[model samples]
Target: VNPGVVVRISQKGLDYASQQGTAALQKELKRIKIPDYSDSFKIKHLGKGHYSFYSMDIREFQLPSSQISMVPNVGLKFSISNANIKISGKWKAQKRFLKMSGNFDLSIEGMSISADLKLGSNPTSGKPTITCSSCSSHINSVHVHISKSKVGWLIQLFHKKIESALRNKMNSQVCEKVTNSVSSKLQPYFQTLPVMTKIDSVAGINYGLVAPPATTAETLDVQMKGEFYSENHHNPPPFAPPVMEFPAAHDRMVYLGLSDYFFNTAGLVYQEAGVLKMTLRDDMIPKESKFRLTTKFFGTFLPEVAKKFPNMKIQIHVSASTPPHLSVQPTGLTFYPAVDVQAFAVLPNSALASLFLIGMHTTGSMEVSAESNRLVGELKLDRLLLELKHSNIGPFPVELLQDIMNYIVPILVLPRVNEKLQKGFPLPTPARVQLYNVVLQPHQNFLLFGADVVYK
Candidate 1:
């Protein structure tokens, strides 16, 4: 299966996200508990030696922000070093069951934590998932000071054993806290990305992963199904997405490539919903137009239609015979829509008497913009062509109807389209993520978007 859209996130992009996430992770790390620890060790001179520390308060803590590296074919590895920590608490020591207790200070130096984050697809929704594994933390030294305790020689004997136990506790806790944060904090945030979401009443956009994300030494690329689907249909669009390359192009943080299939499918969905079909009546016409929707008015040029259906009101039916075709180019985007316009005469009993059928092709250009979480478009009608497909009445020159169609489109057809266009379809972005400094560049059969992201 081909993906209509693909995204590439560069190392610079990862740094931007990591820089913000680590700030929050550091905040979470500060909440890790250094619980009380008690350990006993034997001394030949004394019957038994015992020491314990309790009520530890963090006096100082520092962990430099982590630097992330991409693990090729796997995921991301986040590394942190030169972390320093200091704590103060109460210490108790016992030798031969004789006890001495006093205030104590502890210093932890050169502590480091490295974690690997692997990506997977969620089984239920097929969205991306981040799981942390192979996480480890190391400590260079653990020092303790217990000055106020009486029987200083005995304190020195068992204090070493206590320091060793503290190191193990801090090491395990640091690793545990980060792995849990990756599970409970970070993974849930990834779940918020939109896999499939409704665009309007008739259509939805699929941003689900089409394949596993590919990771290189510096960047990761994700292939996404970006085509729009009719709400009630499960079949794919008529065409397949062409092979396109997404260069890392390290200058920009992120790049999104949307093929013509993405926009073309959107055209098919709207046509499937009968949105391209419109009914034009007298009121839908411009007030200033000299042409009215009555047979008496058209009788000046269409004398045959007037004699056949006298004093009757006229109605126009415009429907897209086929889905609009989209052409994407470096210059801009243009669409050609083939519409069937049938003229009808309204009888005294409100029945329709067919007059003529005309095939209408309106060629137009579009300007695309990003707003909030969706792509919006504005249509500029360029020119239209009309040819008589068939007629219930006798043959009539199609040229005479050109003046009427020229006035009806801007006033009639485009309003319906542009009105709907105002409510643009939703993009593949999550609600919590906002795009910044976005640039949309049109390419051959595709559109490229270069932008940065900010997480709220």
Candidate 2:
């Protein structure tokens, strides 16, 4: 048989996972606190849904508290090899703060990469305030909040792929066999595809960040600032707040179905006011010769006008000065990155729908215990609850402490922070639970009878 030609993977679902789901993970990180540091390459936290550790190798630890029982010191580790890189870390809640970190390595298609990352979050904002510097890439400042669940998912992808490959060469033959067999066999059986399946995405607004394609304007300037409100007025009740609703704020609602899946790769392209051109291999599409090129807009009024009014269309006529670049996945439409046409929509007067959307995206983000990063010693634990009393140890008020904690949390929650860092599976709630229940449940039954699916 001829060697199979390489092709672009269908990453349509990846955008939803990375973009919308990332925002959800950011909100979840805000609920917990970071514990104090005690030693090198080890950390601990005594709050809800936050636990992890890291060093030359990464591992996960446990903290014993009153409400939560002591979990076993379950974890994973990383070792540098000549072949591939390894990545891992942990997150922990302190008396008044939260901390996270992990290691990473990638040796895909002959590219070897590795790094160690550590971050600190304010118990209140849940936003990362500081990051420890690593050899390659380190998040020293986190202006944007990351979702913990999403971060955890990313760790899993890095850990699983590299660890598995480290012991054995990537099974290129098995990969090819699986792809070819599935493609040929599923032609007739695809009708049985599930109506709902968890998928990773690369774009959309389920997460807080919105990824608009990069436009091609000769001169484009941008400015972004945080919209801060008075602390007194912003006082929130205990437990994370339900997601808020701002219908007009988002351009698209990307629904990344489940929590387990993580987006591994993505690519995007766009054009400014210039000639539009694209080049694709002859075999990429069906009816390649007659495929019509058109564009449609939705979500807000800006897109509506851009779609309806020909006058509003970007000017991209081919001329002496307008030479188009022939690249893969060219934007058929022209646009302006500078002009703030209609980026977000404004819902008329429906608070409920607005709130519902916000709740779905930013649910449980506003839960707070007190004014400081720590609560009173009223809460007891099997272990000593270290208050971050001492200060000025690291760049931020709470760095060394978080570093210690990151070295001691667990692997399960590491995926939580990993998912947020990589940007996917934002809020792991009913959506995640339901997806796992549906997708994984079938495995038990399938195994019972040694059932195997066959297609015509």
Candidate 3:
């Protein structure tokens, strides 16, 4: 037994996540304030009193660019380079001959930052965990500005000292702020990459990771328990998941691989839930069809159905003899399912009399697609086989029933199965995240879909 699904996040995906994180980091870091500072100084011929800077608020800040890459043993390495920031504040000084004060701007250039994330998996919930550590920042150069005049002459005397002071403060604050935010703020963001989600009323998809992600230089691959389970029951189906591999196409940001076990479990669950059984009535038959559940219709095929019940409405019941068999091939998908059909005659008081039992063997060429947060399909019946398994009305010639069973299946049976397929299966992502540009294909014994992950 292997995993039902495998997902790979390519280098392109890391770049995108990095860009988004940089943007979000910039917003939070812009709120950084270089706390106001005051100092007393004695310049021999200029100022002989205290000088202070107030309201030192960050007027401009930009992470601008960042890189996120997977490390061999380590989880990830994120870094930013060649950035700049400006802080605006008021500077005041007292001089022996004159007193002067004005607004000054401090620009720090060639700034850089670094952070490493350690990734792991949760023990129980199957969610991934991230730890941001070893963060640092640097400032290349700092410039001071003030109104250049006789007053400026006095401020220029201390510009050298002030540059160093502002530089040190920014480097410290930016590193602290980035590290704090990455660990505390962005941690919750990563946790939202959901592991388990619901598809509809009957079933939900369990995409929990079976193991920690395998991070290579080019991709981060993860295997998932991609089985479908009943919404009301927690037990998984008896079928074992098959091993699957991610797509070799690294062009897309994300790629998902699904094994036959992934879809087979769906058939197993629906079979267990009892939706595979249906009792066809008069209204179920198409108006244009040559037959219905009427006794007159059965009279032509099986004489006992009409002779005994005499003018009563014939009841047609069909139920799954076994779960649907889904197979994935390199060229296309094949859907095979068999159901037992039982014929009954309805008495005037609502009692029923048995008529006959037969089996429907259908094979459909299914076309599947990834849409929104689910997997949907449309099937065209490629072949239909029929046989008389049992009959209380004496065995009738099965060879001539093709035209009759063929139309009946398309009208009553196929529509029921097609309707279920129309409802669709759940994709891995939830409503909060949208994965777009999905392209699906049949690969060996599995199905693969490649797409880009985007926040909704």
Candidate 4:
């Protein structure tokens, strides 16, 4: 049994991986140290006396900055000059482990290293780890030059020996270092997935992985399910995940898909946080200026009536009577808010006051997007249905008042709602993870977000 979750990494994602992987391997290579070599050999000169070089010692080799690049069909190609490498070896036993001392320059042109990528889990924590296995390297060309010395002429005869040693050293040391560094860096991301993400002071989100991440030639896929918990004893109902499909594009670096289940659970969290229910007072509601009322039958006797309310205090209570419902479409997300409204007015020095119970059903559209790991939403009111329960204010312009409320409701409420939506969830990337070519898509029951990940 697996949750319906799919995360796709396109060709662009691979490009990012290549760039960062090369950089990491480059850094590791600089610190590699090769063991010293000691031996003795005899060389005979043409029609001349023979000389024996014994107790030869070679040590101290360092690789400076070198050119590194990724090969699409192959692996990685590296080029370096031997000038940066320093060698100290003895020709004869002048001292213990010291036969000669001089710098040796070597030019290595195009070396290719290839490895098979694998995803495994940590034994202790069961966290995922990306590994480069069965790594092997090939040396294309090698040229050696030794400084002029008493025994320098003999270096040419030993060039093959030195080249073989360098090749083996790089094949084992460089490959192992790169493989270990990348695997260690990628392990934490999987380990921390089951932890909670704090959306606010009172609310937190948890993403539970349903299965291990899968890798292919073009993409890495992850399956996950999520839920919200709160300190206020609010637990949203769990929802079934939607079937997310990877889009047909290779230009983006990363991709994510959030199902409608995620939004529905978010609504419940907001409801528990008291965001969906609001109480309005005089200061909370908008106001207008006073106006004069005149009656022609009364010989121009006029009285002033407040544009909105004067010496009469009004109180309105509004709440999300039902949990907000959401549906994702290609155009945008459709939101249906079930709201209940109650209003009462108190008049000065009057025992008779007005009270009314109003029920409203609001339908709206919202577009959701992401910016720097934050979720942003744009809301538009589409339809409003208001039903009045009772009204004691006789001859009051209820429909006119309803129209005004409709106009002002979105203005006041949408901002508050959007503010919360904007505090969207953080992406699950490691500390050194670099991202590029990000995209967001809305589907039938989910939102798809994608990007390429790079690490250096």
Candidate 5:
């Protein structure tokens, strides 16, 4: 029912398209070459003679700014206001090519253009691209200003002729230019790109398009789904949605939404692969402890007795009992995890084991502004609980073992765990994309991340 990542391009998306997008469009429009048009016509006198006139002209101009608006069930409409067109032409009469040179200025107001486009993706290759099927334009008004000359008034006689020629030329030229410019500008965004960020030595998060791109009057939506997998496991379970909430207003160029289901699914995968387990040897623990009641009692005054157990060995097995539960706050993300630990003691040929249950809680915050390119996370160990389920130590009190763990666990374990947590995760940004003001929101089993982007 839910996809991996859903991208929304709304007014915020167009915000990035404002200055930079406008400049690109202007550059392309200026490159358009307006072909010169020529026509000939003959006028007959009442009884004396007939005069044939021929005219030819060229036009050049610029588009300073264009107003863009979205249309329902259609693509965007661009309205160019006060577009200046400079025209230079020559006309000859009396059945001869006598040059009558003239120049004029024409200003077009409210010239509107729109394109009907479709968003699609290649099913086989999973590559996204947009196609424009039809492009149309409407000229609202056109005003002509002829330069002061002997033939200036004569030009007025051919107003309809001039208007028709200019309209036809503009209709074809503008349509083609607009179509090409839009396609070139938007094509890169639709292409399928890889999301390969390593989470561990053997596992990584991989992503691809789940569905084709979609567009509406309010926004353009793209759905991309991803999964966590390892080389050892060829198939992973489907992601389950978690209970979360979403924010109303998201003003950003890019938004990455992760549901609680996503994290839960990851936890399940890691648990199944035994990635959520750790083993600790006796040598790994610190030796210079002020509180070593059991070891001291056995080794201090009874060397003869300690000699019998000289080959004593200890090992600990720690594994997660369930997936970590996540909750979002204004500050950051909080996690609750249940863990199990087993401690084994070996004396020459016999071994004894004890099971310990742990309640683990941690909170983490992500930072994307400081580095701008990567996502950095800082984790704090908020709470820890240790409960002995079963013990086999001959006459040692379970409370003493808990006391030993209470002092040694933080010193020997948490620091290393925190160090790994601080290494953070990589956030891949597309080429020429600049991001800013990233915010996180929790919604219906997912975490939504929004950031504004500027394309260079």
Candidate 6:
């Protein structure tokens, strides 16, 4: 969760004896090359009549003393160190046949250290191969051999020492270079934006992928009843408006851009006080398999929560039923005859309040295919509730109930299904739960990191 960076470095010149020895070998190569020994000399066209010849010549190999200092991985190894470290996990393959155990590790101290580790396959083939039965895709494999040997140990130890030294000497300089590059890339786009601040009135303004309308009123009467939500405590610093706000029309364009950007980037909903509603036209139905519906819905909501509360977690529920207008074919239908989904989400107060101040609504046709069966469905201004429960928003005066009721009821309608399944109806059961695990038999442990900062 770092936004700024610091770099440190330490460097030592290469050893002289090794450098001289390498130079001598190059000179020897040239002397050994001659007529009928074409393989010993590599010649390539330079330009015009000039040519660059690389023979096993010691003279040709020698580097000017001044230039020698800049050659990396030369005479001997140097040292390095970095302070930052990140970790992550994933599956890998080697020979495209078996599953392998892999672990990835990375360190950003003075020098960066990365390794892809695979265990449990033929020592020659680092690990087993893995394949997906459903997709018919093959994975790669790896092979590594390790044994107690003097030469191997000596080489590895020497390289480790050199790496550590280089990190100590150069990490800070490298880190700074990286930071400058990143800042330069972003400055053109963000320089004119309002600076972040700690004022309560401006909190949770720019946490998610969505940017607020530039012309949104600077003063919002949120918590108009004097009730504070506990979750709001964790929101990002408040907004500090730019010196010149855009016109209302321009602001609307930005709002539209923000909505689409957040939808595709974060794949989640930004919930607030009022239900965000959008109606799906018949032709706008999503195109996906039945199994992917939950994934799509979850993707949309989680990002919205994470932007506000990095620690937020989500749970989803779904079921299916046949609409009254559809009737079974006379012959009969196989597989699942009906499908539906019920989803539930819980967010901390901070996320809820921040999203509410803006607006949230979505309406679209949902299309799903199970096996060979495909269907499209529509949703109206279904229940959209923004509850200020005590558990999430902290305590509030009982007298405020009237105000809360006035604001909430008209927006969301509570469901009213029978407590028990209708007397004569039989409840439906899922046909099956598809579960599969892929095993990449041969692979090395390669470290990968996936992380980002979260704000309200």
- Best-matching candidate per TM-score: 3
Per-prediction TM-score to the true structure, in the order listed: 0.90, 0.13, 0.94, 0.75, 0.70, 0.14
Which candidate model has the greater TM-score, 4 or 6?
A: 4
Ranking according to TM-score, highest score first: 3, 1, 4, 5, 6, 2
Alpha-carbon lDDT of model 4: 0.57
**Model 4: per-residue lDDT, tens digit, 1-456?**
334344565556655565555555565665666564544444454222222333323343333334433343333333433313233333322233444444545555455666555655444443455655556655676555545665554565456355577668866875777567656753444465444567777776655555666655455666655556677786647566666665646767667677677667777777766767775655654455121111111112211122323445555677887778888877778998877776655456533233556778877887776666555677677667877666543334346445546644775666777776666666555455655556677777777776666554
lDDT of 6 by residue, 195-221 (tens): 221223312223211111111122110
lDDT of each: 0.81, 0.21, 0.78, 0.57, 0.55, 0.21
Q: Least lDDT summed over 10 consecutive residues: which range in candidate 1?
A: 149-158
**What is the Cα root-mean-square deviation between model 2 and the actual structure?**
34.8
TM-score of candidate 4 to 2 decimals: 0.75
Off by over 4 Å in 3: 150-160, 234-238, 286-288
Ranking by lDDT: 1, 3, 4, 5, 6, 2
Per-residue lDDT, model 6, residue 62, is 21
**Candidate 2 lDDT tens digits, 1-456:** 110010010122223322332233223322222232222222233333332322222122111110111111211111112221222334332233555453332222222112222222233322222121222211111111224344543344324433343323223321232233323432223223221222232222111111111111111111111111122123211111112111111122211111110110101111122212222221332443332111122112122322333222121111111221111111111111111111112223311111000000001111112111111111111221223322221122223223222222222223333333243322212121222111111111010001111111
Off by over 4 Å in 4: 1-5, 44-101, 121-127, 147-153, 160-163, 189-195, 231-238, 285-312, 344-354, 389-401, 432-438, 451-456
Winner of 2 and 6 under TM-score: 6
* lDDT tens digits by residue: candidate 3, 1-456: 377888888889889878978888888778887766677777666547877778888888876789987897668898999777877888777656556678877777889888888777776988766777788788887676665544655356446456667677777877787777777867677666556666667877788877877788788877788888787766666667656754466778888888888888888888888878888788766577677778888688666767877888877888999988889999899989888888788899988788778887878898988777668898788567888888777878876567767777776677767777787876766346787888887877789888888864
Model 1 reaches what TM-score against the true structure?
Answer: 0.90
Candidate 5 — which residues are off by over 4 angstroms? Answer: 18-20, 38-109, 121-128, 140-163, 192-201, 212-219, 242-247, 250-256, 269-323, 327-332, 338-376, 387-398, 401-412, 415-423, 426-430
Q: Which candidate, 4 or 5, would have the higher TM-score against the true structure?
A: 4
lDDT by residue (tens digit), candidate 5, 271-368:
77776777666566568656432323335543322444453554566677776655644555666666676655455555653423333333333322
Once fitted onto the true fold, the runs of candidate 6 whose alpha carbons sit more than 4 angstroms away are: 1-153, 156-161, 168-173, 194-456
Better of 1 and 5 by TM-score: 1
